Amino acid sequence: SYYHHHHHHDYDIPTSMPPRPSSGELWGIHLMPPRILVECLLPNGMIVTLECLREATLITIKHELFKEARKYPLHQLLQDESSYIFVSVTQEAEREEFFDETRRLCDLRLFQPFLKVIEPVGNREEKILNREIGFAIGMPVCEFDMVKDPEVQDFRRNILNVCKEAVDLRDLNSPHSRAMYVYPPNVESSPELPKHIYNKLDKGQIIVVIWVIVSPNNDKQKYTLKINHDCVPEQVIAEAIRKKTRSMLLSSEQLKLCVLEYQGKYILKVCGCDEYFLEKYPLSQYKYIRSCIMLGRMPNLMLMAKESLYSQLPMDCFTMPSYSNGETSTKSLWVINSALRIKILCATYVNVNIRDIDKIYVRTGIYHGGEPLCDNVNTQRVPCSNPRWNEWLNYDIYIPDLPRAARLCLSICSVEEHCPLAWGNINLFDYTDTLVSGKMALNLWPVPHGLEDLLNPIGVTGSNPNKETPCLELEFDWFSSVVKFPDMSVIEEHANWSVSREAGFSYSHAGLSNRLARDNELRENDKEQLKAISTRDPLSEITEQEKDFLWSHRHYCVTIPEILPKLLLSVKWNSRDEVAQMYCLVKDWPPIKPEQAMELLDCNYPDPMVRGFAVRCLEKYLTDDKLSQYLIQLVQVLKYEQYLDNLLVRFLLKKALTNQRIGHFFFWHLKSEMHNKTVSQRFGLLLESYCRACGMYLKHLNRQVEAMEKLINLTDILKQEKKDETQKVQMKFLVEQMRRPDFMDALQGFLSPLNPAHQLGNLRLEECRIMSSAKRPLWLNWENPDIMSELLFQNNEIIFKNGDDLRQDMLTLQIIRIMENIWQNQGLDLRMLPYGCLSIGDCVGLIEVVRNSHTIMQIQCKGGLKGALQFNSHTLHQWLKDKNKGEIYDAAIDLFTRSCAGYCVATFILGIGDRHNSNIMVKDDGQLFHIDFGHFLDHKKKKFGYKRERVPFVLTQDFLIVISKGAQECTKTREFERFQEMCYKAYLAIRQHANLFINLFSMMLGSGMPELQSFDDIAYIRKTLALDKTEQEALEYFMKQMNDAHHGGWT
Amino acid sequence: SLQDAEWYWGREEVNEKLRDTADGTFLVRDTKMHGDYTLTLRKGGNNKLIKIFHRDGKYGFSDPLTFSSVVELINHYRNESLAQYNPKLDVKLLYPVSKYQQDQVVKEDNIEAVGKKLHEYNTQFQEKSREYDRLYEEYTRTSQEIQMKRTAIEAFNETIKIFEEQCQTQERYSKEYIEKFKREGNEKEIQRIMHNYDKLKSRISEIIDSRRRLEEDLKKQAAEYREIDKRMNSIKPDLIQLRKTRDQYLMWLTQKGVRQKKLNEWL
Ligand SMILES: Cc1cc2cc([N+](=O)[O-])ccc2[nH]1
Ligand SMILES: Cc1ccnc(N)c1[N+](=O)[O-]
Ligand SMILES: [Cl-]
C-alpha cells in the first residue's frame, strides 16, 4: 500500500572516511611483521636469510650478519664489516645506499625485505645526502637528473643564483643575522595600537615579567616591571637588569656601570616557546605582547644569554651541487607574414561508448586568459573508432600579433549534443621565447567535476604525465628558421612609432572608438568616470565602451595607478600595436599596494611584463608579515606562471631562504600538493632548491616529515583493517604501536608543523586517543619541553586527520583571520578564533586544539535534567554563568556578543556550511567560534541553488538569551541593539575591502578545490556583500537578509 | 511588448543563462548613474557587454543614436554584424535565446504538476551527479594504483637485477675456489656452495613470477580504468541535458508565479 507493490528488481542488500590509498612500510603491507626474514646479499655471492626484529638498527643487522656469515662458505673473501654499507631497492624503485646505519629496518621504505653489502662507491659520502633532500620532498633527487627536458635542467642550474644570494644575507653580520634567519621577530605590520587595545593600559603601560636563571639551573627569578608599551627589547632588558642588580652595596653610579657591561650580553626570549625579541620594535608590536594585552595577561619573557642562543644555531654551510639561444641571429616574430595554422593529426586512446556517442572532433582556440580570435573546431571525421583528422586549422590572427603569453587550448568532444572528452593546452612560445614549430605529442587531462565548458583555458599549460590517457598529437607551421619573440629594445621603438603615428591622424578619423578632441586637456566628466570605474571590484566585468574608453585614456590612467587591472583587460592583446604600447606604460607605471598587485598574478593576467610589475610591487611594499599571511595565495598563483623559471618563483624562494618562518610554511604548502601531478614536477624542482639551501632546517623538516609518515601509516591501518573493531580494540592497537621504539623515536623530538615555535617533546600516551569520528582522527599530546613549559602550556595537543581534505577549512580560517585584522586594526573589537589548520598531503592535516571549549550540544547534554524530555534554551546561559561570576560575568557576555557578531557576519558573507549545535563552540571565558565549515561559497547550491543568499548562522533563542543577560523577549533589549550595531558596522567594514576578498578567492582557482572551479563560484561573494548597490542599500539588504532568517528583529 | 520582448529580462544570472551557448547568443539587461540598459553578447565562450545609453528619446551605443527604442536597436543587429560600429566585433546577434521555456516542458500549464516534474528531474540529476562523482573517485584512485604498480614493476626489475648479478657474482668467486685445491673439502665444500647457488636462482625464479603476476593485474586494472572513462563519458551528456531541462522548468515557473521560497521542498 505504501509503494503500490512496485518492486525494485535490481536492488540487492548484499552489494565516512574516503581518500585512499598508499602502502607504507614494505611493498605489500602497511606494517612489517614484528620479526621478519631478510635476505642479506654478500660480496662473495652468498645469500644468508637473517631473522631480524622489525625495529632493528642496521648496525645491529650488519654486526649480526658478519657473525652469521662465518658459518657459511667463502668467509675468507669478506673484509672487516666496517668496510661495507647496506644497499637495497626502496618503494620509490631506487637503489639507496644506507649510510646512516642507525636507521631501523622498518623505517627504510624497503621494497622487498633484502639487503645487499658493498664497499661504499661514490667517495663523497657527503654528496649523497640528497637522500635528505629527496626524503623531505618525497621523491628522490636522482629522478630529476634523468629528466630530458632542458627547461627543467635550466631551472635547476639557474635557480641556484637565488639560493646563493640568500645564504649571503644570512652569514653577513653573523651570528646575529643567522639568529635573525631562524627566529625572525614575530610582529604585527603596524606599530600603531588600536584605541581598544591602548585603553586596556595605564596611559600606555604594561606590567611584564622578566625571568632569569643563575645556578646550577632549576631556580628562576621574577622581576616584574611596568614599562611603557612602546619601549623596545633593549630598554626592557636594562630595567630587568637594573632592578636585578640594585643593592645596598652599590652606589647609583656603580649600578649604571654594571648595567652597561651586562645589558648587551642578553636577549629576550618568550617563556614556553621559541620566539625571541631580536630587533628595535615597540614591545606592543610583537604579536605575543598584543595578545597578552587582549587576553588580560602579563607577558612572561625570559632573559637569555646571547651566547647560549648562538650555541644553539649551527652554520648552514651552503654547497653548490654536482650540476654546477645558440643558433645565430634567428628570425624575429614580426617578420613572419602569415596567419596561424595548426595541423591536428590523430588522437589515439579515446574511451567512448559508440552506441551512446555519434561523432567526435577536436575543438581549438588561441587564448590569453580570454581569447585573441574566433574559436574553431575541425570537421566531425572518423566519428569514434580510430579518430583521425589530418586537417590544418586556420586562425584569423597574423603571426606577429600573437602576444608573448599566447597559448593554444584544445579539447576532443562528442556530438546540440556537445560534450568534452579530454583537454590540454600548449604555450605557443617556449621558455627561451621561441615560437613553437614542428610536431608535438600532447597527452590530455580529463574534464573536472564542475567544468561543463568545452575547452578549459584556465587549466594548466603542458601535457598530462599519465601516459595511458588520450594522446592527441599535432603539428605547427615551420618557417625555415627558429622564430623568436622580439626584444624590448625592438618593442619600445614600435610603440614610440605607433604613438607618433597616432598624433597626425585626422580628427575626422578620431571619431571612431579612440583618442578624440580632448588631446592633453581631457574632460572633467571623463576624469570623473575613470576613478569611478577604478573603484569597482575585479568581478564587475567591464563593457566594450569602457574598454575603448579606458584604452584611449591609457596615458591619464598613469595618474590613477590602481586602474591598471582594469586597463590591462581593455588592451587588445591581438593588436601588437596596442600591446607594445602597454609594455611601455607598464615599464614605469607607479607601483601599487600589494593587495591590489596580487590581482595581477591571477589567471586573467598571464603576461610576463605585467606579472613582473606585480612582483616589483611586492618587492617594494609587501612585508615579511603580509607575505606570510597571503602565502597560500602566492604559492598557488605559481600554477598560472608559463615557465618554471620566473620572477615570482625567485621572489618567494628568496623570502623562504631569508626568513625561516616563511620557509617553514613555504615548504609545507608545496609538499602538501606534491601528489597532484598538475604540479608534481614544478613544486618538486622548487622544493629541491629550498631544501638544498635552507640550512639545518632541512634536518628539522626531515623529522616533521618522518613523524607525519608514521601517523599516515598508523591511521591508514586503523581505517582499512581495524574498521569493524571496537574503539576498545582499535585503541589497544594504537597504544601498542605508539610504544614500539621506532614510533617513540619518530614521534617524540620534533617541531609542530602547525607552528614550529612550539616544540613537541616526549608524547604523553595516556592522553593520546582516537577520537570518535569515523575518519579515525588521532588526538595527540606532547610534553612541552621548554625551560618554562609551566608559564605557557605544560602539554601541547594537535589533531591528526587521515581523511577529509583540510584545504577548504584552511582557506576560510585564513579568510576569517583577515576579516579579524581588517576589523580590529580599523578600531572595532570582534574576536574571531581562527584556530590553526594545515594540510600536509592528499586529504591529510593538522588541526590546533582549543582547550576548554565545547560544542553547544555538549553544553546541553551537561545541562539536561533528569528523564530525557526536552533541552532548555537557558542551559547555555546557565552553563556560562556557572563559569563566569561577578564582574567577570559582564565581560564574558561582551565577549560572547563580540565574537558572535563577527562570526555572524563572516559566516553570512562566506556562505559556509549551515551552523548547528555540533559545529558551534563556546569557551569557558564565553567566546564563541565555529568549527567544521564544510563547503564555503554555497557549494551545496550546485543542487538547485539560485539566489538563495543563505543565512548559515541563525541565532536561536539560546544565543539571544545570553546576548541580553537574561531577559525574556530578548530581541528587545539595548544589549541587542548594540549587537546589531556591531553586525552592521562589521558587514560594512568587509564591504570596503571586497576587492581583496575577491582576489584572494581568485588566486585560489589554481588549486583543485571543487568549491572554486571558476570565477562565478567566487561571484556569490558579490551578492552577499551587495557590491552592485550603494552601501545604504547594502545595509538594508543585509538587514533584510538577517531579518527573514530570524523572522523579526532588524530595522 | 518592450517588457515582454523575448530577449528582454530586466549579472551573475545572465552569465548562467549564457553559460555553454554558442558563438552569437545574446540578451538585454538593465546604477542608473552609469547607463540605462546592457546588451550581453556571447562570443566563443566569453561574454561581451555593450552599453545602451538613453537621453533625448534616442537609444544607442554611442554616436549612431537614431533608433527610437530599445527593440529598434536589437532587430537591426539581429540581421547585421557589429563591426561597422566598433572594429573587432564581426559577429551578429544571431541567437536571441530567451524563450520563456514553453518550447517543451510538456507545455504543462498545471503550475503544481510542473513543480512535481522539477523534483523528479532534480532527483534524477542529483542521483546522476553522485554516479558521476563516484566514478571520478574510481578514475583517480585507479590512475594512482596503476602508477604504484608501474613503479613496483621497476622496483621488481631492479631487485631482479641485483639478484641476477648475485647468482653471477658467486660463479666468479666460487669457481675460483673449485679449481684451486679441489681435493680439500671437494663434495663437502662444493655441495654447500652448490646449495647456496640453487637457493639463489629459484629465488630469482619466484621473484620474476611475482612480477609477471603484478603485470597481469596491471592490464586488468588498466582495462577497468578505460571502462570507467568510457562510462563517465556516457553519463556526461545526459547530465548536461537533464540539467538543462531542470533550468528551463524552474525558469518556466519563476515567469508566472514568483514563488521563489516554495521551490525548496521539491528541490
Ligand atoms: C597555518 C598558518 C598559521 C598561521 C599563523 C600566523 N600568525 O597569526 O602569525 C600567520 C600565518 C599562518 N599560517
Ligand atoms: C568574468 C567573465 C565571465 C564570463 N566569461 C569571461 N571570459 C569572463 N572573464 O573575461 O574572466
Ligand atoms: Cl578545535
CATH of the domain at A398: 2.60.40.150
Please tell me the CATH code under which domain B109-267 is placed: 1.10.287.1490
Q: Is A604 in the pocket of ligand 2 (CB under 6 A)?
A: yes
DSSP per residue, A837-860: EEEEETTEEEEE--SSEEEHHHHH
Q: Which of B46, B50, B158 lies nearest to residue A543, judging by beta carbons?
A: B50
Angle at alpha carbon of residue A482, lines to A477 and A485, rounded to 5°: 95
Write out the H or E segment, with its range, that includes residue B247.
helix B187-256
CATH 1.10.287.1490 domain locations along chain B: 109-267
- A472 Rama sector, left if φ>0, alpha if ψ -120 to 50, beta otherwise: beta
Judge contact between A644 and A210, C-beta under 8 A: no
SS3 A779: strand
Residue A459 and residue A542 in one domain: no
| Cα-to-centroid distance, A848 and ligand 3 (Å) | 6
Cβ neighbors of A320 (< 8 A, separation 6 or more) are A160, A164
Residue A522 and residue A671 in one domain: yes
Q: In this structure, which amino acid lies at residue B228? A: I
SS3 B73: helix
B-chain residues within 8 Å CB-CB of A111?
152, 155-156, 159
Q: Give the CATH number, domain containing residue A607.
A: 1.25.40.70
Backbone torsions φ then ψ of B176, nearest 5 degrees: -75, -45
A-chain residues within 8 Å CB-CB of B129?
942-943
Q: Which residue of B has its CA nearest to A469?
A: B226
Q: Do B233 and A468 touch (CB under 8 A)?
A: no
| Cα-to-centroid distance, A820 and ligand 1 (Å) | 13
Solving technique: X-ray
Residue A479 and residue A504 in one domain: no
| Cα-to-centroid distance, A287 and ligand 3 (Å) | 21
- Closest protein CA for atom 3 of ligand 2: B47
Closest-approaching ligand to the CA atom of A184: 1
Shortest CA distance to A182 belongs to which of A278, A268, A264? Answer: A278
- A953 Rama sector, left if φ>0, alpha if ψ -120 to 50, beta otherwise: beta
Cell of A209: 615579567
Judge contact between A459 and A677, C-beta under 8 A: no
Q: Do B155 and A27 touch (CB under 8 A)?
A: yes
In A435-454, the residues whose Cβ lies within 8 Å of chain B are 446-447, 449, 452-454
Shortest CA distance to A469 belongs to which of B128, B232, B216? Answer: B232
Q: Which of A755, A809, A814, A1000 to mutate to test the pocket of ligand 1 (most atoms within 8 A of CB)?
A: A755
The rounded distance, in Å, linking the Cα atoms of A848 and A818 is 18
Q: Is B47 in the pocket of ligand 2 (CB under 6 A)?
A: yes
SS3 A579: helix
Q: How many helices (H) and strands (E) does chain A have?
A: 37, 32
In B126-185, the residues whose Cβ lies within 8 Å of chain A are 126, 129, 132-133, 136-137, 139, 141, 143-148, 151-152, 154-156, 158-159, 162-163, 166-167, 169-174, 177
Q: What is the resolution of this structure in A?
A: 3.5
Residue A436 and residue A505 in one domain: no
Residue A43 near chain B (CB below 8 Å): yes
The rounded distance, in Å, linking the Cα atoms of B52 and B56 is 13
The rounded distance, in Å, linking the Cα atoms of A1018 and A253 is 67
The rounded distance, in Å, linking the Cα atoms of A660 and A666 is 9
Residues A600-616, buried b or exposed e (16+ Cβ, 10 A)? bbbbbbbbbbbbbbbbb
Q: Which of A89, A420, A1016 lies nearest to residue B15, judging by beta carbons?
A: A1016
Per the DSSP assignment, residues forming a β-bridge with A303 are A268
Residue A345 and residue A459 in one domain: yes
Q: Do A353 and B234 touch (CB under 8 A)?
A: yes
**What is the crossing angle of helices A660-672 and A697-720, to 10°?**
30
Q: Is A665 in the pocket of ligand 1 (CB under 6 A)?
A: yes
Residue A594 and residue A692 in one domain: yes
Per the DSSP assignment, residues forming a β-bridge with A410 are A424
SS3 A445: strand
Judge contact between A815 and A830, C-beta under 8 A: no
Residue A370 near chain B (CB below 8 Å): yes
For A782, counting Cβ atoms within 10 Å of its Cβ (0-12 exposed, 13-18 middle, 19+ buried), the class is buried
Shortest CA distance to A952 belongs to which of A983, A903, A914, A921? Answer: A914
For residue A423, what are the domain limits?
A: 331-484
Shortest CA distance to A345 belongs to which of A386, A398, A294? Answer: A386
SS3 A38: strand
Q: How far is B69 from chain A (nearest CA, A)?
A: 20
Residue A355 and residue A474 in one domain: yes
Residue A342 and residue A417 in one domain: yes
Q: Give the dihedral sign, CA B49/B54/B55/B59.
A: positive
Mutation target to probe the A interface, by most A beta carbons within 10 A, among B139, B211, B229 is B229
Write out the H or E segment, with its range, that includes residue A234.
helix A233-244
Residue A433 and residue A563 in one domain: no
Residue whose entry in the numeric block shows the C-alpha cell 608501474: B150
Write out the H or E segment, with its range, that includes residue A115.
strand A114-118
The alpha carbon of A159 is separated from its chain's Cα centroid by a whole number of angstroms, namely: 22
Which ligand 2 atom is nearest residue A1015's CA?
A: 1
Q: Do A73 and B189 touch (CB under 8 A)?
A: yes
Q: Do B173 and A74 touch (CB under 8 A)?
A: yes
For A491, counting Cβ atoms within 10 Å of its Cβ (0-12 exposed, 13-18 middle, 19+ buried), the class is buried
Residues with CB under 5 A from ligand 3 (ion): A 850
Angle at alpha carbon of residue A907, lines to A905 and A913, rounded to 5°: 160
In A889-908, the residues whose Cβ lies within 8 Å of chain B are none
The rounded distance, in Å, linking the Cα atoms of B105 and B247 is 11
The rounded distance, in Å, linking the Cα atoms of A251 and A238 is 17
The alpha carbon of A176 is separated from its chain's Cα centroid by a whole number of angstroms, namely: 30
Judge contact between A189 and A623, C-beta under 8 A: yes
Q: Which of A39, A74, A93 lies nearest to residue B177, judging by beta carbons?
A: A74
- Residue A825, Cβ neighbours under 10 Å: how many? 15
Which ligand 1 atom is nearest residue A810's CA?
A: 1
Q: Is A628 in the pocket of ligand 1 (CB under 6 A)?
A: yes
Residue A502 and residue A608 in one domain: yes
In A119-158, the residues whose Cβ lies within 8 Å of chain B are none
Residue A475 and residue A379 in one domain: yes
- Residue B116: half-sphere exposure toward Cβ, Cα within 13 Å: 7
Q: How many helices (H) and strands (E) does chain B have?
A: 5, 4
Q: In this structure, which amino acid lies at residue A167? A: V
Angle at alpha carbon of residue A718, lines to A717 and A724, rounded to 5°: 120
The beta strand positions in A535-659, using DSSP E, are none
Q: Is A591 in the pocket of ligand 1 (CB under 6 A)?
A: no
Residue A497 and residue A448 in one domain: no
Judge contact between B109 and B216, C-beta under 8 A: no
Closest-approaching ligand to the CA atom of A811: 1
Q: Do B233 and A370 touch (CB under 8 A)?
A: no
Shortest CA distance to A364 belongs to which of A440, A253, A284? Answer: A440
A-chain residues within 8 Å CB-CB of B154?
93
Cell of A945: 541553488
- Residue A447: half-sphere exposure toward Cβ, Cα within 13 Å: 23
Cell of B192: 654447500
Closest-approaching ligand to the CA atom of A932: 3
Residue B12 near chain A (CB below 8 Å): yes
Q: In this structure, which amino acid lies at residue A1025? A: L
